[PDB]
Structure formats: C-alpha cells, structure tokens
Ligand binder design. Structure first.
Ligand SMILES: [Mg+2]
Ligand SMILES: [Mg+2]
Ligand code: NA
Ligand code: NA
Ligand code: NA
Ligand code: NA
Ligand code: NA
Ligand code: NA
Ligand code: NA
Ligand code: NA
Ligand code: NA
Ligand code: NA
Ligand code: NA
Lengths: 252, 251, 251, 246, 252, 247
C-alpha cells in the first residue's frame, strides 16, 4: 500500500477521490464530511484529520491543513501523491474593507504573497491565482446561499500578528516592512487577511492542481476584534454548506 | 482639458467608461469598425484613439504600444477621463504543446517579468484580472466556437532574452532567464506576452477592471507551420471576441 | 487573561515563565508527565497545552504545529501570558554523513528558509538562540550520554521542495532549491527542520529566550524510513533532555 | 532576412553601423532630413525607419516608442542588421533647481528604475554610456551654444508614479516611490526619462556603443506636467553622430 | 612552500599554529603577541602585521585585519591556506543599549549582516554565528577577568557613518534603508555596532573554520557621560588579556 | 577639529580640495614625492596621509586600505576637511584577453559587487565617475604613451570568491559567484578590483567628484595569482590627471 509520511492514509483509503475540501481546523473536518453521504473517519495525526465521504456518488476527501502555508503544503502534496487533483479551501476571515460586512463571503481571485512557502514552488513574480473553474463554482455556490459575495484579492500572511499589522501584542512593535501595510492593502483594494491562500494557490497553480478559496467574514478589522457568537456560528455553518455545493459543481 | 499623451478630452469620449486596448495602433480602426458609428479621435506616437457605439453605449478603442511603460500611460490617461474597464486584445504565441494555433487564451494571472507593475504594487501583489472581465472574455471566446484556455501568462519586458530567445545578436541570455522557458512550461504557463503584468497589476491595485484575451497564432513547441488562412481567421476572431466581451460588460 | 488561539489564561499557567514547545500535540502530555503534577489545560487546533511542576516551579508545555506561522502564534500568546523562555524539542533529519541516527543536535543558528522570520526582523538579522538556553541544552544532552552536535540548522517552510526532496507528485524542485542540499552540506549545516528560523528570529528580536534541541531520526544520505525501536529510543531521550535543560534554566 | 518588428533587411541599411534612435516615430523624418539623401524604409507599430547619409556614410534613424521594452526590440533588431552605435535623443524633466528649461543633459549613468535592463544584466551592473559617445554628445551640445549638464539620469518604467507624480487618477504613489524625487535630487540626479536605463544597460553588456542626450522641457521643482530646443536637440545628435563616424 | 599573496608569510613561518588572534589595528598585534611567550615579528604589508608567539607551548598567530569585511576576508583566507582553523577577533566597541556600560565586555552570539562580503560566502539567509566553543571560551575568559559580560547580537556594518545612522557627516544624509535603523536595532536587543563580524562569522561558519568575537566597551552612544583616560586604557588592556585567555581555553 | 580616523585637521591640508587615494599606505609617500614639497601628516591603521604641492596648489595623498568600508571612512573624513575631488589609483586584474599587462584602465562604471555602496544609494543607482575626472584620467593616461581602455570594472568585496578564484582553502565559490567571471567577460567587463563601486557610488550620490585609473598586473584568462614599471607609470598618470583637474 502506497503511504504518505504525515497524513496516515493510503490511496485505497480515499476510494478514488480526486477532490479534497481542506479546512484549517481539524475539528471542522467531521462537520464538513457529515454534509455529504457515508462519511468515514480515516486518520488523525498532528493537525491532520482526514475523512472520506460521497457526493453525488463520487468519493471526496476532507482533510485539515493546520494554520499556515508550511503545514498546508504537506497536506496538499501528500493528497496529490494519493491522486487528489482539486483542492477547495474553506474557512473564516477578517475583512479590511469598510464595505465588506461581517457575515459576507469572499472568494479569492488572487493572493498577496506575504508568506514563505509559496517561494518554494515558484518565484515571487508568479501569481498566486486560483483555478478559474474552482473560483467560478465557489462564487455560484456562495451566491446561491443568499450571502453577499465579494470577489477579489486577499493578503496571505505567515503571521497572525505583525504581518496583519496588529499592535496589541507582547512587544507592540511591527517591523518596518509591515508598518502602514494594512492601509496600503486597503488602498489597493485588498479585501481581507488570512494565512494559507498564497501557499495553496501558488503551489497548485504551478503544479497542475486546481485550487480555490472561499471564506466567511467573521470580523472586520475597521470595527472590532471580538465576534458575536450567534453571528459567527451562522457564518461558519453557511461557509461549509457553500464549499460542499462548490464541490458538487466541480464534480458535475 | 486634454490628457498629455493621448490628446483627447473627456468630452471626446462621449461618456465611455470602457476601453478596448490593442497594442498595435493600426488595429484600432479595425476594432472600432466592428461597432457602430466609429469616429477617429487622435493619433500621436503609439497612441491611436477612436470612439464607437456598442448597443448604444460609447466605447473607446486606444492602442498602447509594446510594453508596460507605454501601456501604463494610456491606462492612466484614459482613467483620468472616466474609463474604468479595460479589455486587452491581441494575438500571441503559446508555449504548451496542447495549445493549438487558433485557440484563445484568457489570462487568469500573469508572471510579473516586467518593471512597470512594481510602480503600482510590490512584487507580492498578484497580477490578476477583474473576475467579471475574465468571465465575460471566457464566455465571448467560447461562444465563438474556439477552444479556450484559462491560465497563467508570462509577461516580459523583452521580446528576446526574457522569452529565452537565443537567435539574437549576442546569442546570450542572462542567468535569470537561462532555462526559464522550461521552468514556466513545467509550471503550466500558457504563453509569453509583454503588457499584461503591468496592465493587470496597475488596474487591480487602482480600482480599475481589466482582463486580457488573445488568439494563438504560433506555438514554438510545435513543428507544424500554420497557413495564411488560419492566421487571418485567428486575428479576426480575436477582435470579434473582445467586442462581444465588451458587450457582456455593458450595464 | 484571554488569548485568541491557545484557550488558556494567565491564571491557568500558575506563574510559569518557561515553556517547552514540541511540534506534535500528542507529545505534550508525554513531556508533561516527565514532571510533577501534570495538568491538562486546553486543546484547540494544533495547540494542546499542559502545565506541570519542575523543582516546585510551574512549567508550561504547548504544541506549535508544523511551521513558523503556527509556531509564531503560540509563542506570541504564551508571551502575552508571561512566558519568557521557550525550549523547542523535536526530532530532525541530518544531512551530514558524520551525524548518526540517534545523535542529538543543538542549533547555534538557523538558515532562514522561512517566511515568518521576516515578519519580525529583516533577513540580515541572525536566527540565533539565547546563549543560556543553548548552553543548558548542550549540557543536558551531553549529561544524558548522547553524542551531541552544536551547529547550523536549515529551517524550511516546506518539507518537500525546500528540503530538496524529489520523490514527490511533480518530481520538480524550483531553481532556488535545486542543488541546495549539497550547498548546505558543503557549508557545514547539520540538519533540516521547519520551525527554528521563525522561533529564534522572533524571540531574539523580541526580548524572549529561545533554543532548539533535537534527536536525529533519519540521515538524508542514508534512508528515509526510520527503524521503530531506534526512533522510539531517540524520541524518549529527546524529551528527557529538554526537561533537564528546563531544570537548568530555572532560577 | 527581414527582422521581425522593424520590417527592414540588412541591405536596406546600405552598410549603416550607426543609428539615431528618437522615441517618437514622427521625429524620424525630421532627423533624417538634417542629413543627405533621406529615404523612408518602413513603418510598423511605433517603429518608423529611415536611412540617410552623413559625410558620405550611411546612417539609420529609427524610432523606439516609449519605454525600455519597445526600445529593446529596436536596438536588438538593428544590431542583427549590423548597427553597433546607438545615439538616443529626446526630452526630459529636470529635478534640480539649477537646470533650466532649454538646457541639455548628457547622461553619464542611469538609475535603473526599469525592468528591461534586468533582462540583460543584473542590477549591480552600471547603466553607463560608451565614453566616446558621451564625449561626442557633450562636444556637439557645447558647440551648439547650449548650456550642457553631464550627470546621472533617473530612468523610469512609468511616467506617473515612478516619477512621483500625484496629479493622477488614484493620486497615490506606491511605497517604493514615495519621497523618491527628493531622494534623487539630494543624490545629485539631474532628470527623469523612460528609456536610458534599458538602452545603456543592454548596450554596455552586449558590445554596442550607446549614449543619450536630451533637452529639458520641464523643471519638476516648478510643476508636474510640461521648437528651438527640440530643433536644437536633433541638430546636436546629428553633429554627435558626425563626430562618431570619424 | 608557498608565500601567501597579501600576508607575505609561509606555513613554516607559523611553526604549526592552528589558532590566530585577529585584531583590526596593525599596531595592536605586537601588544597581543607580547602577552604570550617568544613573540616574533613575521611580516608587515598594507594593513596586515603578522606575529607568532607561543601559548602553553603551542604556536599562535596574531594578525591584523584592517577595517571592514573585505580586508578581513583576505587575512582569514590566507591564514586558513597556511593551516589556521580557529580565529579569535578582539577589539573595542561602542554600545547602543543603556544597560551596557563602558568597561563591560560583549561576546557576539550572532551578527546582523549589514555588510557585503558575507554574501560572497553564503546567501543572506545563512546565520552569521560564532563557533559555540569559541563563544563559550570568550564568555568564560571575560567573566574571569572580573568584567560584566553581555552575550548577544551585534550589528555589523560596511560603513562607520551612514550604516551606523550617523548624521554628523559631510552631507548629513542617510539613505532610506538606514533611516531609523539604530532605534530598530535597539528595540530588537542589538548590543553594538562594529564593522567586521558579519563577514568573519559567515565566512568561517560556512567554511569549516571556528570563529568568535569579543570586545571591550569604550563608549555608549545612549549615554552622554565621558569616561576618563584611566577606564579606557584599562578596557583596551583587559580586552586583549581576555582574548589570550580565551585562546588558552581553545588550545587546552 | 580633527577627524575621527585620519588624524589630520583642516589646517593640515593647507587648502587642498583634491586627494589622490591609493590603497596601500606605503604608496602614499611615493605619490607625494612626485609633487613639490611633500610633507608627512599622519599615519594610523591603514591611513597614511601626506600633503604636497602641484603647480602651487595643495594636494592630499591618503591611503584607503583594502575594501569599500575603509575607503568610505577616508573619503568621508577628507570631505569633512574640504576635499571635493578624489582620484583613485592602483593595480587591477584584467579579464578580457585583449587587455595586456601594462595597459591602463579608466573605469566608466562599476559592477557593484560590494556592500558599502548600498549605504549611500540603492542598487539601481549607477556607480559612475565624475565625467571631468574620467576625462582627465583618460587624457593623462594617453599622453603618457600607455594603451588605455575605458570601460566597466567589476568591484568586489572579496579578493577570492567574488573574483571567482578557486585556488583557496575551500576551493568552493558560492552560487551567486559560480560562473561569474565568464558572465562578466561576456558582458564586456574589463577588470576586477575592490574599491571602485563604493568610491564611485558614494561620491556620485554625495556631491563629490571621483574617478579611478589602474595599471593591469595580471590577466585572469592566463592565471589566478599575479606574477614595477607599471606601478610607477600608474602613479605618474594619476598625478598628471590631478594636474588637469586643478582650477
Ligand atoms: Mg482625484
Ligand atoms: Mg584544497
Ligand atoms: Na500548523
Ligand atoms: Na457595514
Ligand atoms: Na549560466
Ligand atoms: Na479589482
Ligand atoms: Na534548473
Ligand atoms: Na512602446
Ligand atoms: Na507610505
Ligand atoms: Na581595510
Ligand atoms: Na547599478
Ligand atoms: Na551551483
Ligand atoms: Na556628480
């Protein structure tokens, strides 16, 4: 049986799946899988929890990535070794534009590469861009849920704190590179911050894999950092329903 | 109030908020004549400017010249005069064996092998089209009956060393570009051209909507040589497609 | 108080100012149980947190996940809760023929093949441990009877191309990393891992004390699949060593 | 063979080894008519090409368009056809208060604020003219009676943000270029234009002789947006060409 | 048999020395050598003055480097060609931290690479770090002298003026890269500026050579208290006493 | 007021506004003695300083040591004391087969393979000489009867790997510099040395006039390590170039 170093699954375990839904949080894996048919737990090791399920009769993998490009790059590579070719990222995000409201959804059309792992696949000049079919399916699924949907650029940072220009920290300092950066991205039309899309999109677009990202907005950095619990719960539930419908459209 | 290089005023554009931007000044009139009431506005340097009407709405056609620098001037000055949507059209060579002469490429992102893009956003920023423009271009290209490829384009400030051409005066390619064509091929890049990184980066970071569509007229991975009829048909299809994409963008 | 990700409060740490930070959440309980009164505090995402007591002093054990990004969150949030000293423990792959499986490595500096270190200091800044922590780790490792190497570690944001692995889906390694393992070997680099550049740069530029100790589980010049009993012995020794290094840091 | 963009053959050039390269295609005939027997060769895109004779020797005049990319095509294709010396003439905006409109500038080196230069040499390489060309341009400019400055030119891939112009659609300039005009002024840079970094780097790294001479049409300490001094500039470049051909 | 090109010495001249003490100033070479047994002048060319001496019966070289990484890189290379494997840098320095006092000693644990020559040996990602044994010996020797010792990061600049953010200069200008840089390094915990350690440490750590740096503090830019003649002469003398004792510990 | 490193005052320079700056302190007296009334001013570290008179005007001669860092100190401190024109003289290794031992090179621009230039101007800025100085150096070199080349010089922070030398302790050259000699040769670069990028960038961005002239002592197409007429000719040329710069 062909094995992988980290994910603890074999190709046979995936029952022919060529599409994976890849949340960051291992606890979200079962929640996504149960929206599909016959969900089965496969493995859990480190930040990687893996389930299989069936969508319109076709096998689909759900696999967490952990936070950050490095752990994401391992999961994507090992799933690709086992036959996966399409990767649908789902999560929640913090918007930086005043016109993007908490509870809206964002489909990334390109990422600002504020990461390191993307450079291990392509030099900085290469665009961190989704597959067009995936982005199209995500937009359609997000609109069909009734959400307000934004298509646009996402800033993808290797840190939660200084690289997103947060000052409420142990040192209260932000290195020169990132001082004033939130305003710069705002002025350039960037919609939101997250921590994995630059790696995911660059890796996949340079390796013959299809990828995209969809996210529900849980905070707006121009407003407040502490989300309201009921609003957050509704946004999380809608986001995973949307990504499953986007997967259905990709497997049509 | 006349913009410095293009030699037109806002009133000359008759309310147009969309421009079709070919590189070659001689193609401007040909595109304008696919629409209604084409009117010559100005010609200076590489910038020939026409207006026309598409479903009753004014549209500008303006050439850019070769390269990001001359393109950046045209986009800026058109934006000063109210243009918000920019549709690049042209023909191109492909670098993938599965892309055939006569197919169409709609760029989903560009490798920034240029300098002017950096005058608008740092290198980390993606040279990506507006999603509505890319969607309209894909639809128009597919409705034409052509085979359409969505993917990455390598956008070079040179025709020769930055496209790893060795049939040159020196035969030299600087270290940065040695082996680069195979690298881009292995990364799935569809084609080289010379303006999209500047155009897409400038527009995506400035509140403007842009995209690129091109007909494939040569493939340097293929031994077969296309004939004159196929090349003429491809050039003609490329501009018919961009006009239909403009139609889809009108509100 | 409250932190965004770790789900613990300052009160939960019972005055701890030192943390042992493995990568794998499953190792946290194993480390905590080498000390007195281990208490499970929280588990969320890749972050499992325990407290224990070492010579009567509270110590926190907190996993980081794989990579600089998740590590940077844990270190920041622990620092918000009063932690000032961070002891990284784990297993590693050596790249030097003279470093044997079962040896231990204490990092004296890291090659910054990551992105998160740049969010704390520009590339010119050295990814260097605190001298007291490195000294304590060397002493603990040597006192255990292990063969110990002090030297430079290459710290990569990827497991695959950034460590020049070719047995992959594409079999390709980007130009930057082609030939890189031989380059690091020739420069005397001991091993690869994926968190030290971020950890050491963040701490050395932020007034925090950090170091890294690791047991060698593979040698890249030999084989990729480790022998089970040898690996188990090395893992057990590594966490015993880091606990003794923590003992040496207590004041 | 006929080169891909310029539409001319080696035979069309009648043995010319020197080219004068203005940016604007409309200036090509104006330069050519200052010499003997000017003949139109071709026009395609931004490239208009004439041949003429100077002291009995064939000379090419070929426009480049705006920017390093289109310039790099013209220089390469002319070099394929035997041209070895390239004399750039154009206009420029001064950034030093003491340089006045109508003055002339001969570039001794360019700040590489372009992309195409990097397709010929890494950034460490100097964007420097051939010393004989720079010497001939200085002499020709002095002999015309103009006030001449030798010095460094900032060569930008954009007209707007890379020259720190703010009267624009966005009114914004990216971090790299904020405060850059003052920085170049403090470093003694004389002027801005858009082709010299590409031209000089490409030629100095490829065995070709190049230089640039320009007329000041605006002082950027005064404002952002701008016949004797266009006419004088092309008279000067033709005299510089005469000095280069023995 | 060969005579090295710049230093003008042969391997036989070194009488088997495998350790060198490398001050910057040629006039300090004899002062260091005379702290050991049987000091003998070997050669002087340009900024390179070379002596041999004996320490606990073992031959030791003392060789000046001149100011800056470039001239240092020549001396280290040519000594390595002649069998030298351990390099102990000694000098005096300013400090940029308020808690570092005149008369204290700094042992460098890593250097900020604000130089060019380090890049001729390893790319910027590589750490400018000392050999651990050398740093340990220098700490012990410095403590045994009675001085207060600081272990930490040093900023190593190719210039004395703009790269140390000095404005009292001919132009009064500091290029963008270095504006605000002193405060940045101070906030990052950097102890001091000097002009050779990044080159020395990077070259040696990437070439199989052991190196370290120790320096006595003779001025503090954050304090406007002028130390007197006595404390400065004492600090220079202590610095070289310390480096010789560190050499003794390396040869034990 | 005495500058920090050079050990001289403004009064010591007797109104000199031009300096000849060799690398080797032992060459300072030799250059000064080619002029009238040479006077030893100071020696400390790699900095030996003399004054002399050339056609009645005071000229300084000051060594720089090897490398951009020590050069940048000397140039700055001389500028603090009123010097505005800096004439670098020295030896060099040619990398073009048509340049012979004994020829002279006047640098028209330098490849910035150094670090100190970046402390004065970002990498995009050209390491170029003042045109008057380069013109005076070309004229002095040609009037001497020498074969003179104008062109680009590669200016390296190291003697060994940055000049792609392999007869070294490690026998290795870092990726950046592997194949670099051939690359510079193909790009028409004439020679290697170690100070011009710093000197020219510093001066061109600081309102100071600088240039470099050098005699060729080795051709790197022949061998790696060099093996007196040329040294003497080079300093005679730089003194005559100084004469041409005097106003
Ligand atoms: Mg406005
Ligand atoms: Mg050897
Ligand atoms: Na992780
Ligand atoms: Na709102
Ligand atoms: Na090569
Ligand atoms: Na947009
Ligand atoms: Na390769
Ligand atoms: Na153009
Ligand atoms: Na700013
Ligand atoms: Na020196
Ligand atoms: Na340059
Ligand atoms: Na190599
Ligand atoms: Na100047």
């Amino acid at each position: 049986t062909k094995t992988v170093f980290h994910l603890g699954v074999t190709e046979a375990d995936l029952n022919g799946a060529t599409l994976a839904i890849i949340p960051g949080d291992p606890a979200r894996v079962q929640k996504i899988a149960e929206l599909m048919d016959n969900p089965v737990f496969l493995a859990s090791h480190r930040e990687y929890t893996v389930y299989r399920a069936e969508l319109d009769g076709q096998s689909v993998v759900v696999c967490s990535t952990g936070i950050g490009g490095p752990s994401t790059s391992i999961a994507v590579e090992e799933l690709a070794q086992l036959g996966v070719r399409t990767f649908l990222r789902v999560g929640t995000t913090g918007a930086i534009q005043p016109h993007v409201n908490v509870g809206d959804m964002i489909v990334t059309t390109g990422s600002v590469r504020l990461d390191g792992a993307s450079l291990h696949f392509a030099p900085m000049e290469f665009p961190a861009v989704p597959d067009f079919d995936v982005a199209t399916a995500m937009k359609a699924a997000a609109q069909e849920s009734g959400a307000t949907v934004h298509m646009g650029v996402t800033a993808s940072s290797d840190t939660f704190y200084p690289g997103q220009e947060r000052y409420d920290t142990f040192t209260g300092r932000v290195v020169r590179r990132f001082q004033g950066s939130m305003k710069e991205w705002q002025d350039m039309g960037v919609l939101n911050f997250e921590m994995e899309s630059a790696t995911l999109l660059t890796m996949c677009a340079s390796s013959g894999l299809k990828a995209g990202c969809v996210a529900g907005v849980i905070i707006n950095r121009t407003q407040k950092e502490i989300p309201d619990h009921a609003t957050l719960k509704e946004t999380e539930a809608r986001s995973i329903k949307v990504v499953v419908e986007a997967a259905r459209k990709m497997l049509k």
